[PDB]
Design a protein around this nucleic acid. Structure first.
Ligand SMILES: [Zn+2]
Lengths: 141, 139, 99, 82, 66, 134, 19
RNA sequence: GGGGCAUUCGUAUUGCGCCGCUAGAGGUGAAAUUCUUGGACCGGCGCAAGACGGACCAGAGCGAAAGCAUUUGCCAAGAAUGUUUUCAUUAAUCAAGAACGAAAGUCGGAGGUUCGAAGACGAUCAGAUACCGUCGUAGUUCCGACCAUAAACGAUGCCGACCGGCGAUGCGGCGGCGUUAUUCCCAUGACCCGCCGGGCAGCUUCCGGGAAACCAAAGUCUUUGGGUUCCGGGGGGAGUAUGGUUGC
C-alpha cells in the first residue's frame, strides 16, 4: 500500500514490450538531446521535461530513443539541479505546511500531516546520503 | 375602511412537508435584495432533484459542486429579477411564482429540478411612510 | 455471543453518529440504531370527515395531512408494540411488513 | 473454470482485463496525428495527454487536459498511427 | 385421490389428443437479427421461411429498484 | 353585531392548542390580536385527569361556538397546535373531538392548517440522558 | 457487587489511606 | 459532514416592553410542591440573549483514530483514478523517543439560553436517602493552560500472495443504441447498458476451517515454517501492597 495512508491504490504507467523506436519517429538521438537541453535551460524538472516531450513532440520514451535517462543526460553535461526533484518537492511542501501552521495554532490535522512529511524527508535524505549524492553533514531546518 | 400593504409571503406547512422525500437532494438558497422604490426583502427559494421517468437507480442525489452551481444560479436569478423592479411588479411576479418556473427552466441543464418554489419572502426594512404611494397601491 | 451481525445498528465504515432523543421517553439514542416511524395521517379520521364536508364553505376542498417523523428507543419501541421479538431465522429477514 | 488456457486467452477478453493484470503488459494509450482546420503542418499528440498543446503553425489550442483522454478542439481531426 | 376409473378414460382421451395441423407450423417465423447471425454461422443462412424484424430501439429491461 | 348581509359569512380564526394535560379552543379575529372567546377543559370538567379528555374538548368547542353565534361570526379558520418545541409534535386527544364539536354547532370550516412550533436544532429536552424511567 | 462500584470503593479507600 | 480562520442565515427555547379576552394554568398512573384578578396560561406585533444546526440524512461519504452536516469566502492538506513522465530499491514491521486523543475532571479569564451532578422541597413507600414531579449550585458554551482514560469495539494488529459465484452502491476512468435540457450540429449535464481499479457493505455457497455461535476469512493447521510488533498461561487475592516516575 501507501507509505503514510491506508489506501492500496494500483495506478501507475504500463510501458509496452516493444523497446524498438517507432518507424514514424523522425527525430534522431542528438535532435532529442538538443530538445532536452533547450527545455532544461527554461528551468524545468526531468518529470515536466519528459511530460512536455511525450505530449508535444511525440517521443514515447527518452531512454529508448537516446539510450540514457533525463537526470543522467543533465548530469553527464552538468545542467542537473543541486537537490534531487523528489526531495526538493517534499521540502517545498513541508515549508508550505509550516507557513500555513505559523498562523493556525488550532489546526491539529496540519501538525499531524507535517510530522508525516518530515518523516518522508528524513527517510529519503538517509537514502541519498547512503548513495553519496548529498554530503554526510546535510541536515533539515 | 382599513388600508393594507405587502409584509411577506409564507408557504403552508402540509405542502412544505409533502415536498421533502427520502431519496433526493434538497437545495435551499436565501438572498437579501433592495427594491428600487426602497423595500429590503429576504427571499428563501427551495428546490428538489427530479426522479427521471426511465431511472432504475433508487436515489437521485446531486454532487456538491452541481448543488453549489444550482444555488449560485437560483441566487443570481432571484437577485436580477427582484433588484430591477418594485413591489407593485415583484408581487405580480410572485402571484404565479414566475421566479420558480424561471429557476426550474434555467437549472435543467446542471441537474433536473422537481419542485422549485419561493419558500419564504420577509420584509426586513421599510421606507418612511407616505399616504400618496399607499393610496396609489389601492388606486 | 454475537446476537446481530450489524450489532443492531447501521454504522459501517464510520466512527461516531450524532445522538437523537426518543419521541416518547426522551432517552438519548444513536440516530442509526433508533426505530424511525414516518407517519402520514389525515388531519381528520374518516369517521369525522363527513361532518367537515357540509360545514366547509369550499366545494371539493382536499383536506390537509400531518407529516411527523417519530424516533423510538428500543425500550419504548418494544413496549409500544410497534416492533416485537422474532425467531433466530426470521430476524435476518429485513423486508418491511406488507399492508 | 478448470480448463482455461491461461497460455492463449481470447483477444477481446485480453483487452477487457486491466492493463497491469494482462498476461503480457501493454498500455491502453496510443500516439495519434492531428490535422488542424486552419493549418497545413501535421502534429503528433499522446491520447491521454496532460498539457494544453499548441500548434506553432497557426498558434491555436489542439487538445484539452481531462481526467482521462485529452478532448480535441472542434474541426481538428485525429487519426490513429500504426 | 379418488380413482373413479370413469373420468380416467376421458382424462386419457384429453392426454391423447393432437390437432390436425401442428402448433409449431407457423406461416412465417418472426426472428430477431442476432438469432439469424447465430443461424447463418451454422450454415442456415439460406432459410427464406424466417423473417428478420428490426431490433428494439430503446435499451431498458430491468425492474426499477427501490 | 357587524352590519353585514345575511348571505355573506363573517370569518374568524380558531386556534386549537391540544396538549396531553389540557385542550385550548380560542377564537379570535382574522389578525389574531383582537380575541373573541377562549374555553379550556379545566372550565368544563372539575377533574385534573379529564382536563384533556375528548368530552371536555367537545364541551369547550360547543360553548365557544354558542358564544360566537351571539357575536355574528359564522365561519372559522382552524389552526391546530401540538406542544411542539423540544416536546411531542402529535396533537393531543381533544383536537378531533373539539373540531367535530365546532363543525356540529353550525359554525362553517375555513382553511385547516397545523401551526405546531417545529424547531430546527433545539436546546436539551426536559428528560435526562437515560430519559424518563416510567 | 458491580465491578465499576468495586473500583469506586477501592479509590475511596486509597484516598483515606494516603491521607 | 476531512482540518483551521473569517462571514452569514434558520426556526425553536427563555426573559422583557406594549395590546385583547379572561379564571384558571403547569405537571402526573393519580396528586401535590409551584405561577395566577398587583392580571397567569392562550393569541398579535417587536426587541435581546446564549445554545443547537431538524426534516433532506441512507447498513451513504471523509478522517490515523477520537471525530466530522446552515450559506459564502480565504489558507494548506489528502485518498482513488488517469499517464508509452521521473528517481531506481529508496521497502515491511517496530524497544527508546514522539504527534493527536470522546465524555467527565482541575486552574485562570468571558458569558450564563436550555438542561442539570450536589442540595431544597412535593409525591409513592412498611422504609426511598432513589425511580415520578417543581426548583436549583458546579457543570454544559467560548479563549488560554493541564489531565491521557471509555464496551476508545469490528470485544478481531499491520504489510504481501492465493482461493467460488451474484446483484447493488460511492469516486474516477473507458466503450456504446436511445430519451431529454443548454434552440439546432457536435460538446457538456441528467438517465440507460456494459467494462476496469480502489473503497462502505450485503446475499448465496458442503472451497475450507471452528467446541460451536458463526467466518469468504476467524480459510490456505499434525499434508504443522511468507515477514514482523504487542501480548495470555485454572479461579480468587488484584490492577491490591510497596518502590519508582508523571501531575496543582
Ligand atoms: Zn424511549
Amino acid at each position: 500500500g501507501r507509505m503514510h495512508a491506508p489506501g492500496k491504490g494500483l495506478s501507475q504507467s504500463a510501458l509496452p514490450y516493444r523497446r524498438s523506436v517507432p518507424t514514424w519517429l523522425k527525430l534522431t538521438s542528438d535532435d532529442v538531446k538538443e530538445q532536452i537541453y533547450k527545455l532544461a535551460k527554461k528551468g524545468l524538472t526531468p518529470s515536466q521535461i519528459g511530460v512536455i516531450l511525450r505530449d508535444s513532440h511525440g517521443v514515447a520514451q527518452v531512454r529508448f530513443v537516446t539510450g540514457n535517462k533525463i537526470l543522467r543526460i543533465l548530469k553527464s553535461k552538468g545542467l542537473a539541479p543541486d537537490l534531487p526533484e523528489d526531495l526538493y518537492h517534499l521540502i517545498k511542501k513541508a515549508v508550505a505546511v509550516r507557513k500555513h501552521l505559523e498562523r493556525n495554532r488550532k489546526d491539529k490535522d496540519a501538525k499531524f500531516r507535517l510530522i508525516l512529511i518530515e518523516s518522508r524527508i528524513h527517510r529519503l535524505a538517509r537514502y541519498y546520503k547512503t548513495k553519496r549524492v548529498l554530503p554526510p553533514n546535510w541536515k533539515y531546518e | 375602511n382599513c388600508l393594507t400593504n405587502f409584509h411577506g409571503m409564507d408557504l403552508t406547512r402540509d405542502k412544505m412537508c409533502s415536498m421533502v422525500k427520502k431519496w433526493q437532494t434538497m437545495i435551499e438558497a436565501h438572498v437579501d435584495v433592495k427594491t428600487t422604490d426602497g423595500y429590503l426583502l429576504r427571499l428563501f427559494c427551495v428546490g428538489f432533484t427530479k426522479k427521471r421517468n426511465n431511472q432504475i437507480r433508487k436515489t437521485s442525489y446531486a454532487q456538491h459542486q452541481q448543488v453549489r452551481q444550482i444555488r449560485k444560479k437560483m441566487m443570481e436569478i432571484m437577485t436580477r429579477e427582484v433588484q430591477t423592479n418594485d413591489l407593485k411588479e415583484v408581487v405580480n411576479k410572485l402571484i404565479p411564482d414566475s421566479i420558480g418556473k424561471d429557476i426550474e427552466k434555467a437549472c435543467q441543464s446542471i441537474y433536473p429540478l422537481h419542485d422549485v418554489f419561493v419558500r419564504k419572502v420577509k420584509m426586513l426594512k421599510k421606507p418612511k411612510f407616505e399616504l400618496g404611494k399607499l393610496m396609489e397601491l389601492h388606486g | 455471543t454475537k446476537k446481530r451481525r450489524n450489532n443492531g445498528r447501521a454504522k459501517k465504515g464510520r466512527g461516531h453518529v450524532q445522538p437523537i432523543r426518543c419521541t416518547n421517553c426522551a432517552r438519548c439514542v444513536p440516530k442509526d440504531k433508533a426505530i424511525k416511524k414516518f407517519v402520514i395521517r389525515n388531519i381528520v379520521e374518516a369517521a369525522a370527515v363527513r361532518d367537515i364536508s357540509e360545514a366547509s364553505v369550499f366545494d371539493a376542498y382536499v383536506l390537509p395531512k400531518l407529516y411527523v417523523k417519530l424516533h423510538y428507543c428500543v425500550s419504548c419501541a418494544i413496549h409500544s408494540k410497534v416492533v416485537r421479538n422474532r425467531s433466530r431465522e426470521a430476524r435476518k429477514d429485513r423486508t418491511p411488513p406488507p399492508r | 473454470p478448470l480448463a482455461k488456457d491461461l497460455l492463449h486467452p481470447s483477444p477481446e477478453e485480453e483487452k477487457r482485463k486491466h492493463k497491469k493484470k494482462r498476461l503480457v503488459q501493454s498500455p491502453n494509450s496510443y500516439f495519434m496525428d492531428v490535422k488542424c482546420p486552419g493549418c497545413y503542418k501535421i502534429t503528433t499528440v499522446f491520447s491521454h495527454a496532460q498539457t494544453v498543446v499548441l500548434c506553432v503553425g497557426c498558434s491555436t489550442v489542439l487538445c484539452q487536459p481531462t481526467g482521462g483522454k485529452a478532448r480535441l478542439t472542434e474541426g481538428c481531426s485525429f487519426r490513429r498511427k500504426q | 385421490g379418488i380413482s373413479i376409473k370413469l373420468q380416467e378414460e376421458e382424462r386419457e382421451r384429453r392426454d391423447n389428443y393432437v390437432p390436425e395441423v401442428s402448433a409449431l407450423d407457423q406461416e412465417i417465423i418472426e426472428v430477431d437479427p442476432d438469432t439469424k447471425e447465430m443461424l447463418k454461422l451454422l450454415d442456415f443462412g439460406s432459410l427464406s421461411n424466417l423473417q428478420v424484424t428490426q431490433p428494439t430501439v430503446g435499451m431498458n429491461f430491468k425492474t426499477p429498484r427501490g | 353585531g357587524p352590519q353585514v348581509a345575511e348571505g355573506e359569512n363573517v370569518f374568524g380564526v380558531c386556534h386549537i392548542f391540544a396538549s396531553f394535560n389540557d385542550t385550548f379552543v380560542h377564537v379570535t379575529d382574522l389578525s389574531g390580536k383582537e380575541t373573541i372567546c377562549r374555553v379550556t377543559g379545566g372550565m368544563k370538567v372539575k377533574a385534573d385527569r379529564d382536563e384533556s379528555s375528548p368530552y371536555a374538548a367537545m364541551l369547550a368547542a360547543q360553548d365557544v361556538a354558542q358564544r360566537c353565534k351571539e357575536l355574528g361570526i359564522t365561519a372559522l379558520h382552524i389552526k391546530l397546535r401540538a406542544t411542539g418545541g423540544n416536546r411531542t409534535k402529535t396533537p393531543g386527544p381533544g383536537a378531533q373531538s373539539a373540531l367535530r364539536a365546532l363543525a356540529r354547532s353550525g359554525m362553517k370550516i375555513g382553511r385547516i392548517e397545523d401551526v405546531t412550533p417545529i424547531p430546527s436544532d433545539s436546546t436539551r429536552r426536559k428528560g435526562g440522558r437515560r430519559g424518563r424511567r416510567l | 457487587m458491580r465491578a465499576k462500584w468495586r473500583k469506586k470503593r477501592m479509590r475511596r479507600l486509597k484516598r483515606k489511606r494516603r491521607k
